[PDB]
Amino acid sequence: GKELLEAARAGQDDEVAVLMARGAEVNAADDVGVTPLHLAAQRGHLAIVSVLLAFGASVNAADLWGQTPLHLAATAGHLEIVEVLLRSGASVNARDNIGHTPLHLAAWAGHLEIVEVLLAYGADVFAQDKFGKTPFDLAIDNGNEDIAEVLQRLLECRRDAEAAINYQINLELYASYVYLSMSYYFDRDDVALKNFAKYFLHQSHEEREHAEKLMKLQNQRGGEISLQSISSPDSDDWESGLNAMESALHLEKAVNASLLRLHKLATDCNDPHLCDFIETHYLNEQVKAIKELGDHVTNLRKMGAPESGLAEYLFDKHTLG
Amino acid sequence: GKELLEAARAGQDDEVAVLMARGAEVNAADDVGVTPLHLAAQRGHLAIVSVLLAFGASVNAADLWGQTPLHLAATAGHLEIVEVLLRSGASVNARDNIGHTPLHLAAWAGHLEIVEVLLAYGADVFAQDKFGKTPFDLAIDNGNEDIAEVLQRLLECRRDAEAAINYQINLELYASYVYLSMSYYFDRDDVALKNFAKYFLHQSHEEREHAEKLMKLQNQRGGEISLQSISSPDSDDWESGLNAMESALHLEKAVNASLLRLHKLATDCNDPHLCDFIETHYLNEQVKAIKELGDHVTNLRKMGAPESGLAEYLFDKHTLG
Amino acid sequence: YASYVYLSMSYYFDRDDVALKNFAKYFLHQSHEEREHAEKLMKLQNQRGGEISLQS
Amino acid sequence: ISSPDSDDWESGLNAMESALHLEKAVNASLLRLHKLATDCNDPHLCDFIETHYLNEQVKAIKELGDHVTNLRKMGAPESGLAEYLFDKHTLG
Amino acid sequence: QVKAIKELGDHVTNLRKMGAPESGLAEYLFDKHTLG
Amino acid sequence: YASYVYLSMSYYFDRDDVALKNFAKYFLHQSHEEREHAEKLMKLQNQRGGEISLQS
């Protein structure tokens, strides 16, 4: 009923064994709320926590102070207990009264391997306590040096991915604006080409769908969209249909280069979902766009444009309409 | 690895406790195939089998001789071990090399309460061994008196239910034959009533569906259908429509009485499915048949039959057609 | 009598140590055809003015 | 929920026989619960048990015993082309 | 009656040639292919 | 510019600490209507013979 806890505290693995074989209280709440699992985690005793878990102990046991065996085990420094608790269902994001999470304590105490296993199981790096500190702060105010480095790397990966997605949103909005300009150039009455105009209006709308997809993505990730100013296109007079097609080709190539840079960034920081998203929705459309626009340019050049009217007229009639 | 079995045999519950707390072989196969559970069941040691089941022992462990902890526990006489094994998934119908089932041994040894708990969990009373004996035989050739009585009661319940279902099949076949006779009486040309004929032919076919339902039932239960001779109806001349309706009424009442006797029999022998079957398919149709045939008889009697032609003519026209 | 024999045959193949379903359907069909056969002869004997006398 | 006793059910015959024993154990538990509800005068529980549970177990046991005798007569498990043709003709 | 006798003799010779009654998989396949 | 402002407004109400979906649909609809409005004026200025000069 109560005589098991002192044997757990003294490390009497055989005594708690023989006394738990006989019907005994496994989920004992004590004079301050310390279950035998808590005391078996404070001291480093793997056999006791194993034979206690097998007999039906609770890994999440709300101590009178707000602690859990994972808290005390991460604070102590015993890695095997941390592993066997994480595999049994311990919650990596449980709070104290101060608000500390097991990673706060892992960073304060200075346990690198425990920090790694806690980061693998879903502990978040920018979580705060009541007083406003993140594990990186408890790491830098205590001289624990490498905890700080491996947490700074993750903070920086998240910040840089957020920034690159914002820049891609701005780049697609700019491309949409450039295509709108191109389209209303071919609508003048000294440039009377209607299917060039329809072509570039269609591209203008597709490029806005592209940017809204990235906005939705960044809201799904929990990041912050920060919209910016959209530059005006470099020209108002796109001299001909050939020159406009070549400018669209260079623009599509620049967009594709930015996508490749963002993909390499998401690969460095171990982000499978971002890489899958980029290559599923964005890398096969750019290849097809570049192929098609290069086809248009060689067709127009062979037919004899720009020095030939009746080349752009018949291209506009037969290929674009 | 092996040092746990002698402690199980000596009844050292605390030793096997402390030694199983430390990583030890729970499903140990030994020099003749005797697992610690077998030896913990032979001797009466409930704590050891509990702490062995909790640590992942197999209740069905094919000994080199064909035994299982349930076999040895039923032979010994310890009821608590039998219960905790039956609740953990022990198979009540496992065989030896001789072919004995745990009930064979429960009946040989003379353990009444174990026989009861084994009968509650699905042990069958007429199972045989290689030499052809049923638990009742091992009970009567050993002077074990009450095992024999409580097994004879069950053998007799099954035999009597089988016999009553056979008799009900024969009774419905006879009723079908009687209705066929009645129907082809009203088809003569000195008895020119067509809707009386259609009525009784319909009843003739319904009563054969009734008997095929009981044949299917008896095949679902695992019993043996034994068909018999069908008597001929008592009359070939059913004097009038009134007299034929009254004879049908008495026949339906006799059939209903037999159904009630069979239901009381199935209630005495604790057979919920048979009772549910009888009252679902058979007891509400008889009530409606009796109500309808009594209605027909009072209508015919009030209109003035049998001493009135133009009473049965108009009944045949208006009520039966 | 033939109808009764076919009914017996049909419910033999329905046991679970004799698990043949289409043998069972076959013999049930024959069981019903043989009762139609006998009702035809009953109708005939009523058309002729004779007396049906059913037996065991 | 305990894990099943085997991961390797040696053949189709052995798996059908194991399913048969499992259905019989389930039916025994239902009968015990029905007797309990009868002792304590609980008409609605008894009606529920025999309406939804006692006629399905009987049909399951009949069908699984049919499958076992068919497979045994065709010549399984020592015969391929017995379980192949059973799988083709009876189960599909 | 003539058609019934012809058909039932056909069934008997088919079953005998396939190898029944000493062969399961003869009555199984007869039941599957001829009667259903 | 008004179209851009409405797009910002719409994707604000899509965050998961601001879980209002019909506010989001509302402001997206307004965002698209305001671009139709500007394309109408571009077409007008091409009908008049003037020069469109787009800006930041």
Residue numbers in the entry:
A (entry chain A), B (entry chain M): 54 to 374
C (entry chain L), F (entry chain F): 227 to 282
D (entry chain B): 283 to 374
E (entry chain L): 339 to 374
Paste lines from the article.
In this study, we present a novel DARPin–apoferritin scaffold, with a larger size of around 1 MDa and higher octahedral symmetry, meticulously engineered for the binding and imaging of small target proteins via cryo-EM. Our most efficacious constructs, namely models 4 and 6c, feature a designed ankyrin-repeat protein (DARPin) rigidly linked to an octahedral human apoferritin via a helical linker.
To facilitate two-helix bundle formation, we incorporated a glycine–serine (GS) repeat linker that extends 12 Å beyond its predecessor. Additional enhancements included strategic mutations at the apoferritin–DARPin interface designed to bolster the stability of the DARPin component (see Sections S1 and S2). The sharpened density map showcased the strong density of the apoferritin core, along with distinct density for the DARPin and its associated GFP molecules. Model 6c notably succeeded in determining the cryo-EM structure of our target protein, GFP, with such clarity that the side-chain density for nearly all amino-acid residues was discernible: a significant achievement in the realm of structural biology.
